[PDB]
Amino acid sequence: RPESELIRQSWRVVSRSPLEHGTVLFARLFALEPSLLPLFQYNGRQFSSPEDSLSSPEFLDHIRKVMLVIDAAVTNVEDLSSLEEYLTSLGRKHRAVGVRLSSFSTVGESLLYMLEKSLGPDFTPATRTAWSRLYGAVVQAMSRGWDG
Ligand code: HEM
Ligand SMILES: [Ar]
Ligand SMILES: [Ar]
Ligand SMILES: [Ar]
Ligand SMILES: [Ar]
Ligand SMILES: [Ar]
Ligand SMILES: [Ar]
Ligand SMILES: [Ar]
Ligand SMILES: [Ar]
Ligand SMILES: [Ar]
Ligand SMILES: [Ar]
Ligand SMILES: [Ar]
Ligand SMILES: [Ar]
Ligand SMILES: [Cl-]
């Protein structure tokens, strides 16, 4: 398709520095939905503030994990059924830790935000539409993990 190369092309520069870029996504995510912060409980303890999360190795390791799942979705953009299985399980786990399926709309806007900010003029409405569709495919697959 042409959408696939829009995604592949947009992801290139972001994918080279995954923690720097994922740190934008999370900072935006906590700015939109502060109530996500307490859901990371490493040694059953809660982050008081967003800048607290950024000092946590485990938290930063979760940013890399997110970005690796996105790298998988970009990799397999033309055949996503393969990931469907993993993604339902991923969804299950995120129900187990306290994530409300509604919070993933905030995730999508954070991912668009981060991409818009690294691409500037290159993130065209077509690029936005391409990502919104891929992210949608991801979220359908993970939401099976709440039930469906
Ligand atoms: C509101 C958004 C999210 C919250 C609060 C959240 C929270 C968590 C928590 C608490 C864990 C277990 C602790 C840890 O491994 O670091 C986890 C694991 C994970 N998260 Fe997230 N998460 C969210 C979104 C995402 C998204 C969007 C992705 C991927 C696209 C993702 C990928 C993962 C992965 C890969 C793991 C490892 C699970 C496993 O295989 O054990 N997370 N997340
Ligand atoms: Ar991320
Ligand atoms: Ar953050
Ligand atoms: Ar991962
Ligand atoms: Ar993955
Ligand atoms: Ar994703
Ligand atoms: Ar999880
Ligand atoms: Ar996320
Ligand atoms: Ar994401
Ligand atoms: Ar998205
Ligand atoms: Ar995605
Ligand atoms: Ar997917
Ligand atoms: Ar997602
Ligand atoms: Cl490259």
Q: Say how many Å lie between the CA of residue 44 and the centre of ligand 9.
A: 24
- 142 within 8 A of 87, measured Cβ to Cβ: yes
Tell whether ligand 4 has an atom less than 6 A from the beta carbon of residue 65: yes
Q: Could you tell me the distance, in angstroms and rounded to a whole number, from the CA of residue 13 to the centre of ligand 6? A: 17
Count of Cβ atoms closer than 10 Å to residue 145 Cβ? 19
CA dist., res. 54 & res. 57, Å (int): 8
Element (H, E) at 12: helix 3-16
**Cα–Cα distance list, 61 to 27, 55, 108, 126 (Å):** 15, 11, 20, 31
User: Which helix (H) or strand (E) covers residue 107, if one does?
Assistant: helix 103-119
The number of distinct structural domains making up the chain is: 1
Report how this structure was experimentally obtained. Answer: X-ray
The residues with which 45 forms a beta bridge, in sequence order, are: 42
**Ramachandran assignment for 70, one of left (phi > 0), alpha (psi -120 to 50 degrees), beta (any other):** alpha
Give bridge partners of residue 42 from the DSSP assignment.
45
Could you tell me the end-to-end alpha-carbon distance of the chain, in angstroms, rounded to an integer? 29
Resolution of the PDB structure in angstroms:
2.0
How far is Cα 55 from Cα 10, in angstroms, rounded to an integer? 28
Question: The tokens of 144 are what?
Answer: 């099976």
Q: Which domain holds residue 134?
A: 1-148
Give just the sign of the alpha carbon dihedral 108, 79, 74, 98: positive
Which ligand is the nearest neighbour of the Cα of 67? 2
